[PDB]
């Protein structure tokens, strides 16, 4: 098909330690190249690429515009942070932890124990594997954190094993939605 | 840091399509329907605690269209170089036979933001219950998108997330099927 021309504009509010520190980053992007940006820590517009030179010069020549952006960290960032804090920064959904081996094999033959942790939020989460009380740090094949696109995450953490009768593997999960770490076992 | 709220918008030619959405730590908070001229929240729960004047978004888009025109000329009409998408089909939760589930088609790292997506059950298009998100921004300025297909697990059915994009030689099919 024909050539495409893309223009993107992003206003990013970076919040550190709640609100004690807020950086505002306004970016203009042409196709895939940022051309000009305003950094609240800098105070003015800066051309990133030559295509942005004309704009940075024109915009830094307008006082009202300069005054507006320099206060945006309060009138915009800190403000919008409040408007939705109750259901974003405070949102919490407990993970669903399931443990199952991948392919039904007779004992003593190598197997992949799967610890599925799904539907949780926020993304910050910790999953550890245990073999009869001792933590298994090796042979852990993970997908890493996966964002589902609907405010929930999921992660599959697999453990390489060669189950011997009697062994007890435990998948321990820690997440800000639960007080005491969740645990689920699988008997060999 | 801790959190990030991103107001992201764009306009693409010749498509004449635009977008306006707010993002919180990677997730969409809401976006503005250009046609209906109303703000649409990702989770309906959000509309019960906040609101947004959709008219404002339309104003920005008008200005963006005009700016795109200006940038295109000044760049001497250099077009965007296509970046084909990475596609992966996943399940929402571990599957059990005859236990409703959801197939997630995760389209990532691509540009421009135009993509034709089709769900196929045994080679036939399906629409029953399908849902999709708008284009989510990425730090590298490429885009991310999601498509959903709720279904009932079985041994008799196979699925495919068909994805078309200009940076792709031909339609890409991502296959999924129960494994017993």
């Amino acid at each position: 098909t024909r050539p495409r021309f893309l223009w993107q504009l992003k206003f990013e509010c970076h919040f550190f330690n709640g609100t004690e520190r807020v950086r505002l980053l306004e970016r203009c992007i042409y196709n895939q190249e940022e051309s000009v940006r305003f950094d609240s820590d800098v105070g003015e517009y800066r051309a990133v690429t030559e295509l942005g030179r004309p704009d940075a010069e024109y915009w830094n020549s307008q006082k009202d515009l300069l005054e507006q952006r320099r206060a945006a960290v309060d009138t915009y960032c800190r403000h919008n942070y409040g408007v939705g804090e109750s259901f974003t920064v405070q949102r919490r959904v407990e993970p669903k932890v399931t443990v199952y081996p991948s392919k039904t094999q007779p004992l003593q033959h190598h197997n992949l124990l799967v610890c599925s942790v799904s539907g949780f939020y926020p993304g910050s989460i910790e999953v550890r594997w245990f073999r009869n009380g001792q933590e298994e740090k090796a042979g852990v094949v993970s997908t890493g954190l996966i964002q589902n696109g609907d405010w929930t995450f999921q992660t599959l953490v697999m453990l390489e094993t060669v189950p011997r009768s009697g062994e007890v593997y435990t998948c321990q999960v820690e997440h800000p939605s639960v007080t005491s770490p969740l645990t689920v076992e699988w008997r060999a | 840091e801790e959190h990030v709220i991103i107001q992201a918008e764009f306009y693409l030619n010749p498509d004449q399509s635009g977008e306006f959405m707010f993002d919180f730590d990677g997730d969409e908070i809401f976006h503005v329907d250009m046609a209906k001229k109303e703000t649409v929240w990702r989770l309906e729960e959000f509309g019960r605690f906040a609101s947004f004047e959709a008219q404002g978004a339309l104003a920005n888009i008008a200005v963006d269209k005009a700016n795109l025109e200006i940038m295109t000329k000044r760049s001497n009409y250099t077009p965007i170089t296509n970046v084909p998408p990475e596609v992966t089909v996943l399940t929402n939760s571990p599957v059990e036979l005859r236990e409703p589930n959801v197939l997630i088609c995760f389209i990532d790292k691509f540009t421009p933001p135009v993509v034709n997506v089709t769900w196929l059950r045994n080679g036939k298009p399906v629409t029953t219950g399908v849902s999709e998100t708008v284009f989510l921004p990425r730090e590298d300025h490429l885009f991310r998108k999601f498509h959903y297909l709720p279904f009932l697990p079985s041994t008799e059915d196979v699925y495919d997330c068909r994805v078309e994009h200009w940076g792709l030689d031909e339609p890409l099919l991502k296959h999924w099927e129960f494994d017993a």
Binding site: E57, W59, H79 | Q7, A50, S51, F52, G56, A57, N60
Partner: peptide
């Protein structure tokens, strides 16, 4: 509470 938008500026002509 209402979400505040930042206005897009017009580029240099």
């Amino acid at each position: 509470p209402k979400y505040v938008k930042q206005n897009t500026l017009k580029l240099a002509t």
